[PDB]
């Protein structure tokens, strides 16, 4: 079942030499054709078909003047790729169709055909649906939610009514992780959507939500205060502190220098509270490097 790979990998390259009009028909013909492979072979046989659909949609935008229906054809491409990934879900597949839906949303956001906002929103909605339903391992949940936040932070096709659902659902899903360190890391990662992530209502510029950013980090510190393991606790404090540094260096006026001082004070308070090991040597070097960065171009206290 792991053999036809390169075969399709061959068919996908050579076919890229034809015409997009024909390229749709050939992909469509390989569709029911390859889906008849079974619940075993399509694991390695349909992902190339999905990526070929996305690539061909970009190619259709390439001919935006030589074709007046490239928007309609792109709606066709993304609906066909939706059906293709849903077929991958039918064979009980949790983590691969999730990334495929995220990639579909990213591509639809960049292409910019007519009705592409709804398509990208729908792909993201299914990404969250597979995240809630079928992914249960803590490690896989953390990896998936980090993937969702990274992907979602980069697209700028949503309006605030459409941008806010995924923002808040990222906040909730990341906050409902199993382990406590996982929760802290995901909530800390969530600030990037409020700061860097863009939306259409600002005509392209980022939200620059400075004050919501701190609320995410402040919730991560409250979680770090519940780790019940000094070694891991202090590490979470150093990580969260470096997130504070990241936003302060990007002109987040709501990141007061005093918060930096209090947070570094807690670490100096309970850093000697651990004993020698390789792990503590790395933790000490992490913190020492963070301060030595602060000392570089010494600005304020």
């Amino acid at each position: 079942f792991a053999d036809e790979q390169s075969l399709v990998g061959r068919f996908i390259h050579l076919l890229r030499s034809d015409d997009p009009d024909q390229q749709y028909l050939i992909l469509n013909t390989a569709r029911k054709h390859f889906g008849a492979g079974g619940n075993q072979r399509i694991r390695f046989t349909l992902p190339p078909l999905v990526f070929a659909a996305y690539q061909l949609a970009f190619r259709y935008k390439e001919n935006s003047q030589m074709d007046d229906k490239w928007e309609k054809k792109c709606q066709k491409i993304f609906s066909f790729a939706h059906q293709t990934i849903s077929a991958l879900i039918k064979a009980e597949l949790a983590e691969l169709p999730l990334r495929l839906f995220l990639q579909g949303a990213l591509a639809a956001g960049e292409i910019g055909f007519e009705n592409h906002e709804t398509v990208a929103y729908e792909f993201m909605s299914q990404a969250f649906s597979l995240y809630e339903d079928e992914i249960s391992d803590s490690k896989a949940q953390l990896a998936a939610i980090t993937l969702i936040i990274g992907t979602f932070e980069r697209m700028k096709c949503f309006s605030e009514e459409n941008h806010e659902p995924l923002r808040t659902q990222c906040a909730l899903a990341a906050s409902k992780l199993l382990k406590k360190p996982d929760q802290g890391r995901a909530v800390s990662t969530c600030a990037h959507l409020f700061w860097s992530g863009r939306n259409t209502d600002k005509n392209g510029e980022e939200l620059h939500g400075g004050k919501r950013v701190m609320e995410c980090l402040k919730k991560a510190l409250k979680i770090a205060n519940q780790c019940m393991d000094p070694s891991l606790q202090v590490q979470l404090f150093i990580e969260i502190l470096n997130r504070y540094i990241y936003f302060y260096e990007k002109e987040n006026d709501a990141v007061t220098i005093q918060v930096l001082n209090q947070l570094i004070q807690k670490i100096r308070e309970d850093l000697p509270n651990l004993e020698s090991s390789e792990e503590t040597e790395q933790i000490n070097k992490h913190f020492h490097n963070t301060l030595e960065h602060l000392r570089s171009r010494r600005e304020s206290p």
Binding site: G9, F44, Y54, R99, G150, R154, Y246, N289
Partner: protein
Amino acid sequence: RMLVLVLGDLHIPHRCNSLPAKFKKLLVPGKIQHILCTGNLCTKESYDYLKTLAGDVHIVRGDFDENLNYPEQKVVTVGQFKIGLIHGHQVIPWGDMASLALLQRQFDVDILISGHTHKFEAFEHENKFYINPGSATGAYNALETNIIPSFVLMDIQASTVVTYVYQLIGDDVKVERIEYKKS
């Protein structure tokens, strides 16, 4: 005298059947002492290719790697240089330079190398060195439409990395070099 090969994001066979011919010709066994791979060579086939090129192969899990073993992040030493390995999809924003240097601080590596951007970048910041080869096969990236296949190899002398970058610009392979010496 040691030379290593850093390459990733081949995406075989999701978006790429195989590497570019000129590339395939330039990578021959024996010359390359170590191989540091970042991206997702989605199938073990390409892993056995990288094991053909050299004996010490170091890969890290990417977002699309169906494998069962690759670690999310690795820190390996070559000679005297501390090298950090990570694909780069957990380094949010994906291409953020300020976010990568943060990983450097946490890692305490002298050279931190990542991918998932499919854009090659080699720069020195805060007296530390950051390298992103990109896709050796010039795979598809949703955010960049004019992608140039590239890879990088660094010959760690002794407290001195020289990094050469091969690129398939047009038809012929154009190369560039950036140098960095230990802090």
